[PDB]
Recover the amino acids of this structure.
């Protein structure tokens, strides 16, 4: 998260750390807790890989301070996900959890946007995650971050993109500040966009992509693009 | 190298594999043999690191049958190298070798561009190295690659970049194919750009940077950017 600040523990009860087994476990993406044995993330976070765990109720990743955890037993990526397609289409996946994660302590389940939700253009929303604090940094964040930003319409999103990368679609929900100073970054992918500037809010997006250059991987000068939960809600529910 | 083919051993007599000691030795960058005890690479290949060796007259890395090698005693990075500044300026370094490497067999010393050399805009050139064969691949190349491409002027270079990445400078030399299919890739940094499409050619650039995204780390749809040897020749000779 670029341009944000430390969250407090429990501020995003459904925020997960999605961990991949390399040499040992490492944070690769965010994820979103939906139910005791179900979670939601970006398809690109799991596609082509195997060996995952989610941490629930965590705050400072190097402290190993999670409250609950479960192995991921199975993953369903959207069948029309295309890692290399314009706009990274259909960048959503559900995950089945081996062990139940209970709504307790600082852990809780997200309320997803309804399929008939409005598009929220102009609304304040929050991005959260352990992604890099700046696109040039070599490491991800130690402490969970969040930032308040503004949802834009599809047309507005594309107007804010590079001229040859006008690939934002209605299946996306994009945020951008008018100062060009906040956004998501590597390590935030698969996490939640929470509606509203404060308090409890529905989860309306899943972190997916943004724009970089050779010295800064996630430019707040350009929007951050999420998979739109209302567009994918029926599919998420069916999978 | 993207869009290229297997080279032959000795095709580029001055091409080195710059190895870094981690778990075991591994290829981290290219380098360019300048003389019996001296090599050239990119500053970002050596800055902040130590414990290097160069392999000369190599071909297939897994074969381990380079003709000659040497540990590196010390490295010197350009004093104005800036990994964060637009254009990653001054990305050159020299290296002193513990063991003399002879010009013999498939190993020879580069002829560097003189400081009076022109821009070479429009000319063909060759890129060589063990970088990845595609930006979406996980691993570097096993067999040394090369590709023929076309040198572009500073202004033409920038015209072929994204509008928010107009970072090419006169201290760079860039190459780009109109078909958008050739370029350097991670693992190629530090290696040579050789003037001309065939024959003995002077070394006119050092591999430095290119455009990527989170799923494809090098994009031949945009130019590949090298440090221009003519610009840096006096520094290289003195260091």
């Amino acid at each position: 998260i670029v341009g944000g600040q430390d969250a407090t523990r429990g501020m995003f009860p459904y925020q997960l750390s999605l961990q991949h087994m390399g040499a040992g476990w490492y944070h690769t993406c965010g994820a979103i807790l939906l139910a005791a044995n179900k979670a939601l993330t970006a398809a690109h976070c799991t596609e082509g890989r195997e060996g995952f765990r989610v941490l629930a109720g965590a705050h400072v990743l190097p402290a190993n301070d999670q409250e609950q955890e479960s192995d991921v037993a199975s993953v369903t990526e959207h069948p029309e996900f295309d890692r290399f397609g314009p706009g990274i289409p259909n960048d959503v996946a559900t995950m089945a959890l081996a062990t139940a994660i209970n709504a307790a302590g600082n852990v809780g389940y997200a309320t997803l946007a309804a399929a008939n939700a409005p598009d929220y253009a102009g609304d304040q929303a929050r991005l959260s995650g352990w992604g890099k604090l700046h696109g040039a940094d070599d490491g991800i964040a130690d402490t969970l971050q969040y930032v308040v930003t503004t949802v834009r319409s599809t047309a507005d999103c594309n107007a804010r993109m590079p001229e040859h990368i006008q690939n934002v679609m209605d299946q996306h929900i994009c945020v951008h500040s008018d100062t060009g100073t906040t956004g998501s970054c590597q390590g935030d992918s698969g996490g939640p966009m929470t509606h509203g500037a404060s308090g409890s809010g529905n989860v309306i997006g899943v972190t997916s992509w943004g724009i970089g250059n050779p010295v800064e991987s996630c430019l707040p000068d350009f929007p951050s693009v999420y998979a739109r939960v209302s567009y994918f809600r029926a599919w998420i529910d069916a999978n």
About this structure: Chain B has two domains: 5-9+110-230, 15-109.
